[PDB]
Amino acid sequence: PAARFQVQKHSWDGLRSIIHGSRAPHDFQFVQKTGPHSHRLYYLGMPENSLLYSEIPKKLLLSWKQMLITSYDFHSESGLFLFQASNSLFHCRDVSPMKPLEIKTQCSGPRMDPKICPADPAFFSFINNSDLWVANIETGEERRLTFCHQLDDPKSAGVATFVIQEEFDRFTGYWWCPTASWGLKTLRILYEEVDESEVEVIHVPSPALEERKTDSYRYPRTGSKNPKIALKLAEFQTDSQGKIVSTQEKELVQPFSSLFPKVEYIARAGWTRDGKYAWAMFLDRPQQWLQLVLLPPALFIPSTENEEQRLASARAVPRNVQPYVVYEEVTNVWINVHDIFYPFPEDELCFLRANECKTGFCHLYKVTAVLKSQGYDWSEPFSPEFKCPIKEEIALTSGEWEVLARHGSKIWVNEETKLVYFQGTKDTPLEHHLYVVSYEAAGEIVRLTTPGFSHSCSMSQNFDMFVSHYSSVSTPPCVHVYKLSGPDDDPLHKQPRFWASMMEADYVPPEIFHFHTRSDVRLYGMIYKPHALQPGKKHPTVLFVYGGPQVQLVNNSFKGIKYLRLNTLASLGYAVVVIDGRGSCQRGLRFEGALKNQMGQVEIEDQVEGLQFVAEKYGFIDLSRVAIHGWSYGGFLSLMGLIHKPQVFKVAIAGAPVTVWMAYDTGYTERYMDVPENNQHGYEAGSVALHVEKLPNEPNRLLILHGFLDENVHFFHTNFLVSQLIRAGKPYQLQIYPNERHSIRCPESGEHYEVTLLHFLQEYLH
Amino acid sequence: PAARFQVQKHSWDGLRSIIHGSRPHDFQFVQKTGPHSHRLYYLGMPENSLLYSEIPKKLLLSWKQMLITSYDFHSESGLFLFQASNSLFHCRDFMVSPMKPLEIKTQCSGPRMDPKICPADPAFFSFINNSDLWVANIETGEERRLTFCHQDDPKSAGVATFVIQEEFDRFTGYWWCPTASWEGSLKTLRILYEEVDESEVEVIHVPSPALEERKTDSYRYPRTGSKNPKIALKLAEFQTDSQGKIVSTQEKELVQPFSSLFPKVEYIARAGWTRDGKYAWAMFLDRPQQWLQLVLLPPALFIPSTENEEQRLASARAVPRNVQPYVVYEEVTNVWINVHDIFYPFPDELCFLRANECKTGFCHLYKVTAVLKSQGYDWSEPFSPEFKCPIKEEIALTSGEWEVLARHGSKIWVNEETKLVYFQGTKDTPLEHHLYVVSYEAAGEIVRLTTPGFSHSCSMSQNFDMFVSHYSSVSTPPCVHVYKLSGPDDDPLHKQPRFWASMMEADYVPPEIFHFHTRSDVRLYGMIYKPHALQPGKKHPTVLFVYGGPQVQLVNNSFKGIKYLRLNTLASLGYAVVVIDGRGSCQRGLRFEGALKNQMGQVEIEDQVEGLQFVAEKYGFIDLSRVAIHGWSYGGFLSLMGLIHKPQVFKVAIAGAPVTVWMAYDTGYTERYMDVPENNQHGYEAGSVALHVEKLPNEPNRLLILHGFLDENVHFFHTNFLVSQLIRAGKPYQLQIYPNERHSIRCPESGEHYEVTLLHFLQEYLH
Incomplete structure (x- = not known):
């Protein structure tokens, strides 16, 4: 009953006092x-x-x-x-x-x-x-x-x-x-x-x-x-x-x-x-x-x-x-x-x-x-x-x-x-x-x-x-x-x-782990434990994501600078989980080649499997209360999670998502997805804006963050998604970053990004 | 104790079913x-x-x-x-x-x-x-x-x-x-x-x-x-x-x-x-x-x-x-x-x-x-x-x-x-x-x-x-x-x-027109949609709809049902919908309209507050602790001034297509009423809501910004610049885009969404 851990609620000035404190x-x-x-x-x-x-x-x-x-x-x-x-x-x-x-x-x-x-x-x-x-x-x-x-x-x-x-x-x-x-x-x-x-x-x-x-x-x-x-x-x-x-x-x-x-x-x-x-x-x-x-x-x-x-x-x-x-x-x-x-x-x-x-x-x-x-x-x-x-x-x-x-x-x-x-x-x-x-x-x-x-x-x-x-x-x-x-x-x-x-040299580092899939392939992972854990309590959980080619999140080097906010998440009682799925970098060509012509499809099984292994090994994952979150490819995957696996993912905070592969460039997409003429089925399957019908009917389950000036992943992506969400009749929340491109460079805009994120989880991860 | 009308909380698909059922x-x-x-x-x-x-x-x-x-x-x-x-x-x-x-x-x-x-x-x-x-x-x-x-x-x-x-x-x-x-010779x-x-x-x-x-x-x-x-x-x-x-x-x-x-x-x-x-x-x-x-x-x-x-x-x-x-x-x-x-x-x-x-x-x-x-x-x-x-x-x-x-x-x-x-x-x-x-x-x-x-x-x-x-x-x-x-x-x-x-030739219950006088002794007209099946005693929550800017007169004797069907829909869920023709409006002569000369935003909300306070006394069904302000173009601009200078009155504020920056707006409109920014700098600044963002609420769920992405007239820049300044002042906001809409929402699909967002936002956060 009270076995599950409720996160301490906060006023908005409270939450930005917490984050400014970081x-x-x-x-x-x-x-x-x-x-x-x-x-x-x-x-x-x-x-x-x-x-x-x-x-x-x-x-x-x-x-x-x-x-x-x-x-x-x-x-x-x-x-x-x-x-x-x-x-x-x-x-x-x-x-x-x-x-x-x-x-x-x-x-x-x-x-x-x-x-x-x-x-x-x-x-x-x-x-x-x-x-x-x-x-x-x-x-x-x-x-x-x-x-x-x-x-x-x-x-x-x-x-x-x-x-x-x-x-x-x-x-x-x-x-x-x-x-x-x-x-x-x-x-x-x-x-x-x-x-x-x-x-x-x-x-x-x-x-x-x-x-x-x-x-x-x-x-x-x-x-x-x-x-x-x-x-x-x-x-x-x-x-x-x-x-x-x-x-x-x-x-x-x-x-x-x-x-x-x-x-x-x-x-x-x-x-x-x-x-x-x-x-x-x-x-x-x-x-x-x-x-x-x-x-x-x-x-x-x-x-x-x-x-x-x-x-x-x-x-x-x-x-x-x-x-x-x-x-x-x-x-x-x-x-x-x-x-x-x-x-x-x-x-x-x-x-x-x-x-x-x-x-x-x-x-x-x-x-x-x-x-x-x-x-x-x-x-x-x-x-x-x-x-x-x-x-x-x-x-x-x-x-x-x-x-x-x-x-x-x-x-x-x-x-x-x-x-x-x-x-x-x-x-x-x-x-x-x-x-x-x-x-x-x-x-x-x-x-x-x-x-x-x-x-x-x-x-x-x-x-x-x-x-x-x-x-x-x-x-x-x-x-x-x-x-x-x-x-x-x-x-x-x-x-x-x-x-x-x-x-030379309030941060508690994550610990690395590995596990095997049902298909017997070793995936490395990482976990931030809820600070001052009470063994017995099932805490709510934020699954941080990228899961696209050219990247390796989980590796043995210091994360506290770039991903400080995962520690902040964990200091308030969230469990932050990070998994490198098949497709990620640094483990050879076949491993990464999992993606070929099939983006979106292969990456969530490995993430779902990641969480469940996390939940058995570590005894603090309330799987009813799980949030998927990420930028660029990760925002793309946050929305795929919420489409393919709504039973698993209660909310989704999708940052800068690639919502239409046909609007993305040659260099990246053709490398992995071929040409839309040759791989129609795969381009459509991994375009999240063509599957808006499957997104949630209830509100408070989906937050869209996008930087207005995005040179690389054009605001068109978010804008064409909202376009389709309106046609499908589905609710959405939205935050814009008018002076930001792909990364949020400005500290003020970043503080606001992190505060919104905390509030959104606070109010609606239930 | 339990004499304050509670609106029935519908699911999102329920709310679509109600809005769809109107049209x-x-x-x-x-x-x-x-x-x-x-x-x-x-x-x-x-x-x-x-x-x-x-x-x-x-x-x-x-x-x-x-x-x-x-x-x-x-x-x-x-x-x-x-x-x-x-x-x-x-x-x-003759055919x-x-x-x-x-x-x-x-x-x-x-x-x-x-x-x-x-x-x-x-x-x-x-x-x-x-x-x-x-x-x-x-x-x-x-x-x-x-x-x-x-x-x-x-x-x-x-x-x-x-x-x-x-x-x-x-x-x-x-x-x-x-x-x-x-001609010639x-x-x-x-x-x-x-x-x-x-x-x-x-x-x-x-x-x-x-x-x-x-x-x-x-x-x-x-x-x-x-x-x-x-x-x-x-x-x-x-x-x-x-x-x-x-x-x-x-x-x-x-x-x-x-x-x-x-x-x-x-x-x-x-x-x-x-x-x-x-x-x-x-x-x-x-x-x-x-x-x-x-x-x-x-x-x-x-x-x-x-x-x-x-x-x-x-x-x-x-x-x-x-x-x-x-x-x-x-x-x-x-x-x-x-x-x-x-x-x-x-x-x-x-x-x-x-x-x-x-x-x-x-x-x-x-x-x-x-x-x-x-x-x-x-x-x-x-x-x-x-x-x-x-x-x-x-x-x-x-x-x-x-x-x-x-x-x-x-x-x-x-x-x-x-x-x-x-x-x-x-x-x-x-x-x-x-x-x-x-x-x-x-x-x-x-x-x-x-x-x-x-x-x-x-x-x-x-x-x-x-x-x-x-x-x-x-x-x-x-x-x-x-x-x-x-x-x-x-x-x-x-x-x-x-x-x-x-x-x-010629369930919608028409609004009642009234008038009243301001403390300075000027006659203002106003409308009200009563909550359907009213039980006197119950104090209902109130949506103050508005425009307020020049060249317009909302309140007059003519059929409103067509363009303001949403106002009746609001009424049918139990919301009081009030509409007041503030000072600066059309069809009351030049001196009436001229109350806005060089001080846009400053006089209109005071008339609106008085219109609320009158309607509360006149009719016995307005809960003043729960009041929402909402409007488009000038109205959204005003909805934000209400939330700025009257937070104790307005619990929430749904601002659509707002003029956040007067200096960004065109000559023909702005100069006629506000003068040129080189002459009247005190009044450009005073009535530009984006420069007073520090005065918006520290609480979340009190401000919903709506804007059409293709606005030829009130450019998206305004919402963008507002969001810029909310971010910089550390204030929350909710936001909604209409990617295919210029200034009026023309698409029925886009309008149905607009209204279900409006009912949901009020349902949850108007308390």
Whole structure:
């Protein structure tokens, strides 16, 4: 009877008194001294996120020396720092602090995407009004290279399109060539042509509500056309006085569309160390194919509107020269883009490659391809091809665990010692650890980071130092510094000794658990226990959710910062439960591949099963009083829960829900759900706005939160749901966040979000 | 103890079951020359369409079919020009079977707005295509453009802009000349039109109807304070062969600019021509809207147009020195000018009729005689203003504490044979629109023609031998009776209206009208719906419905059941529904309406509170501890002021489509009443509810915000900005969107939801 625990009710000022009561170093660069200190670490920090440093001794908490910013570019030899601070451009070279030298300009608009020329630090680049610009920090001489820009000005150059930034995690459309050819010189830049003419335009309202205007995004929805892309060279010569004597636009000797048919997106691109070949990863529209291709500079002829003077150049391209397809990946699930690709320094290329499609788990391979120069008439056109034969493909790691290559995880390769350092899950899926392996000999795989914590690491250029940014479910986050030390004749077994420390430590942490499904698959989970529990009492329960691809909620690292509100929920007597269902990240391709063409359907069984296991193991779950809650995919799932499982889920608080997959973009949806023409059944099944008939008849069971300015998940989603709820005659409550986009950035808006949530549960979880 | 009526708590599906369970005009008299005396032509809906009745020589009239909201008619040729679907249609008339409408094709790409038949020649008509004036010929099929302002692209022609359409209730900006000239030494045909340069006007984005497409529409929306579009009057002439072909054409412009001849002229409220064709008249208006004045523009005042400024001087010299514009009438006020559209000119002088509220305080007719004597002007040179004619006489044909209906497409009907003027008014009572007659020669005996004890919407025959009245009362449903003026021909004033025939005929319990006096001794009217099956003793919970803003009068003697069925539904669950006409309302004169001048929100709620307190004492069934306030546009704005300045009175507040920010609203409305924000900053701030959000309730479930997402008028921005400021002040709110609704909820599905949300919200939280 009174066995079940009623949550203490509160006035609204009470609840926002409760919530108001509630309320790290990165981008490291190691450099040696050559005195008392061995190196100097450069990094970003926020003790306002500015540039800082520390001093590493020869013989303890390192102090944070001020030097003077989301990012910056560094150059080893010259010691040049180049960053986008203010709404302007700044630099400085490197005991006491120095104020940044401002780089004055003639162009109007911001200077996006600043990078320094590696081959010559006097030079550097930036975007301006969708075109590429060279400059010189010494002389101050600026100059435009691309000429695409002039509402219907579609062509752009050096820019990564909407879907490329948001769904392929790439934020530039240009890459410096790392060497020069010669008292004249020259410097090249690979860059990306983009005609966004075919792409559909969406209107979203801007920050300034007062002036009642909208911005004009190019938003390619699924089935609709993506932008038309191409690779290109942009050369420019210089004399000894640092003067841009001339420039050139360079198109491929044939079209990119006919050389490389079946290429839909440019996931990544770059250059070989020595500067010889340029490379790029190309993907197809299904995203079930990914070839990595070398493009020689001689393959690029100058651009001219004169067809005779082009055939002059198109005849002078050597017949031996061609693009080389060194690698190719193929799957029936989906090729996730893995950043890792390390070419070694001529009738063959040796490189490393992250490859999940082979065995099912991302692992490092050493691969040698063979560049059979094949003879081609490039003044004449044609179409298929360039798939080189593979000389060998030695597999350096294997098992049922991952090498981390996404989310800007990276490898580090010492060529002297023949060792490659990586990060992976080998020990557990709950902890990101730092491994080393030889690349000659796929031998034993030594770990450097101690278990019990999930680590986020960065190695020194000289492979002598490394930093780790680790944390556990219970303990707060530390940033320690380690120094690899031992006999040089045995480098694979260098012992990481604790050298120094940079960061250190009403919250009760959750405890992690696992269980098995009725189909015998291990799912990890997490639970916040009701604070000051009385064993015997069944408390009411909030099931927090995401359950979409590209994510892992449950893992062994500190949650108290981002998910403080789950602790707040638990401090008032709620049970907060979190389950990673089939579909979630970090446990291989098959596990995640559960989602394929079937979104919504597979994810709730695992969540229902999660709760019931929680309720048997732990003796405090009143299953009559359960609330499902989440944002984006989770808001989508909160509504699916309330449709598919109303017996289980009493209320639902759906934040930013994807309510119509057909209105969502290509990049995300096609990867997982195919094209609406091919997978109609699945698109309709997982569109919650087409199943509003099954939502509750009674009110107080469904709350909709949506940020008005949402660039990514458009307010249209909530607005089309309310549209359908009104037609179906179903009740709904609604909260709007007028100044918020996808995340709630403003503390005030967030306090209001959390207070509403508490009240809603308080009043109506009964 | 247990003497407070409890409303029965229904489930949501129960409440839908209850709400679901709840749910002739534009007349043209033409005589015949048999059994039937006339044929009455009109719009009607047994969709809305063209119909006719047969009025006999000697009972319920049949509705015959001709075959559409607005149509045009020409008497002699019997031409019916109308707009149907996304195209133009016509027909002519005596049929016995119905005739199909003949279709008129076009070479122009886009729809053809605003169709009007040339009065002088029925073969010709005109329309707008892409913000430019066109001209056509029904018989020959030949079209022909006349303006070239269109080709972002901000110059328009023959268009009334946003603020003019929705605040000055004018829906065309071109006017046909009623006569044809044969000048030279080819038959000419003029049109007066309004050129508009809406370049300097702010663009606002409003969501489009097709939600899937996720695109907006630009709207040239001039905020209060900011600039309106820049206007001008212009002459577009053309000529025709005796075979009926548009041979020549010509744009014309004033010999000096419009802006220089007429400084301080912010808006062209109205315009047209005198019946003979001599002068083109126009009502101008200033930015304060306190200086309206009538002007005549003689056709020789307009020279041709060329890009060459030397071709211009030549014909600027050519225009007769005597000719000019004559400022005939000048209304001035310390409150504001309401545009009264009544202006009847007759054939050295000009004699006209004109409605004038600014003179005595009540809209009354006058006979005015002005004197057009030319001063002699050198039109090659420029100048600054002057043109005010001296008045011969200004006889007043009506006077009292009651008014002549002039706004809202009301009108006068002037028989020039009998010297009588037929008008509508409030002479008997402010609660009843009645048809009156008076002589314009001898202003004495005002004879009422409509039955007392009801309120009437009327329309005279052009022959003044019979009229229609569409009438109703608070209790009885609406009727439409056809009356016939009948009696001795020697005394036309006392011709007796005899009932001739009827067109349309008449659990809802009607409301009771009452009045009471305020502590300052002003008479206010109000309604009440009693709770059905009342048990005296029980104190019921009360929904104070409201609007309160200008240009409206809710409380009057006429059938409310149609638009306020929800109010009766509320009553049938046991809610008292009270409605009070606060100070600042329509149809009580200028001084009554002028209690809002520069302090909007501050006076209305005090009158509403007194109306509640009176009704509680008068009737014994109002529980004052449980009172809800609710309304739309101004009403939702007020519902929030009630909750701000009277939380101790109002338990809850359901605010629909509210004006949360005066600075965001348009000029035409806001400035007229609140002035410009540079002058009256104290009152903009005081009556903008979004700046007083800190004073809303700390408790939840006391404030429900309703808003349609596609609101062209009261933009969603207002609710968005309110929600912004509630969030920032840490105040709860409930909220409801109507994604497919602009300003009035039009969809029945959306309206059924609106009402079930209203019943549920009150059911649960009105305690």
